[PDB]
Amino acid sequence: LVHVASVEKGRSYEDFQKVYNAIALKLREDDEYDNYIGYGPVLVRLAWHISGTWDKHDNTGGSYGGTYRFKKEFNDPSNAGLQNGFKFLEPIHKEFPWISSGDLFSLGGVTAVQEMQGPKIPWRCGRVDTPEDTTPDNGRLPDADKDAGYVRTFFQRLNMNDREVVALMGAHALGKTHLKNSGYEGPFGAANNVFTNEFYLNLLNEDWKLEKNDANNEQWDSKSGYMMLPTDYSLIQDPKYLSIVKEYANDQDKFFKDFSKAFEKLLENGITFPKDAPSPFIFKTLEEQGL
Ligand code: HEM
């Protein structure tokens, strides 16, 4: 397929900054969600899930079409719990009905990161809502009960190399696992809603014990009370991945830079941007705007 980015007719930067501002202000206000963690993490996951169904081989899936809106994609068992991110964005959508769904879901991901003190992620508008029929079948999102090899291979379908996968994985410093959603339970770290290189440090410095949970799945549990999925732990089992985790554990800055690039790339997979398209936008945070 060929998915060409088409700007929302008549809209510019300022129009988008306003959508961002609305998502941001609503993140600030609804902070009771999930025991005071807020919706930041779920939105990050939301943007990654809508973009992870991409397949470099035939161009299907990816964020373009906003297919997550259709039943089949919405009801994907791997997307269990995402419904909450979606409800959070509905009123936003009703307030700016001109934005395409794929642009809104991805933007929310960008806003969450930034408002959570993460790096600035350049973003581009242009996604266009496609028909129900372009909805990818379930099964394209990864399983968490595997190893590094699995990880490597899987990521390959999205065009990501070792550095890219390690980077992207640091998102697992945010939020937690929920038994009813995935069969996993427990916060990944301590900050939970502040974006840092925590993930890497936790991986190198905790005393993890392999245990089974009430869902009967194995998970790595730490004495401080955190958790790591088998796929997460495999990052320290692979020699190539391990040196990357060390780098990140040593330089938040480098991580932020790498994550940023990678994040954008992830959200743009499958999209063709015409030569006249506006450059990517860099939104100001509520803080930078004094709001
Ligand atoms: C092999 C790769 C991955 C696997 C198998 C995976 C699996 C999981 C699992 C099973 C959950 C818990 C969901 C719940 O029960 O509510 C989760 C949570 C999370 N995922 Fe990942 N994940 C991976 C990749 C990613 C990446 C690439 C991103 C973004 C860059 C990310 C962002 C997060 C976030 C922020 C949450 C926490 C959500 C919340 O607090 O509701 N994950 N992931």
Swiss-Prot record:
PTM comment text: CCP1 precursor is processed by the rhomboid protease PCP1, which cleaves the N-terminal hydrophobic transit peptide. The m-AAA protease (composed of YTA12/RCA1 and YTA10/AFG3) is required for CCP1 maturation: m-AAA protease promotes membrane dislocation of the CCP1 transmembrane segment within the transit peptide to ensure the correct positioning of CCP1 within the membrane bilayer, allowing intramembrane cleavage by PCP1.
Compartments (UniProt record): Mitochondrion matrix; Mitochondrion intermembrane space
Modification sites for Phosphotyrosine: Y150
One Gene Ontology cellular component annotation held by this UniProt entry: mitochondrial matrix
Site (Transition state stabilizer) residue list: R45
E.C. number: 1.11.1.5
Family of the protein in this entry: Belongs to the peroxidase family. Cytochrome c peroxidase subfamily.
Name this polypeptide is given: Cytochrome c peroxidase, mitochondrial
Source organism per UniProt: Saccharomyces cerevisiae (strain ATCC 204508 / S288c) (Baker's yeast)
Gene that specifies this protein: CCP1
Full-length numbering of the shown residues: 71 to 361 of 361
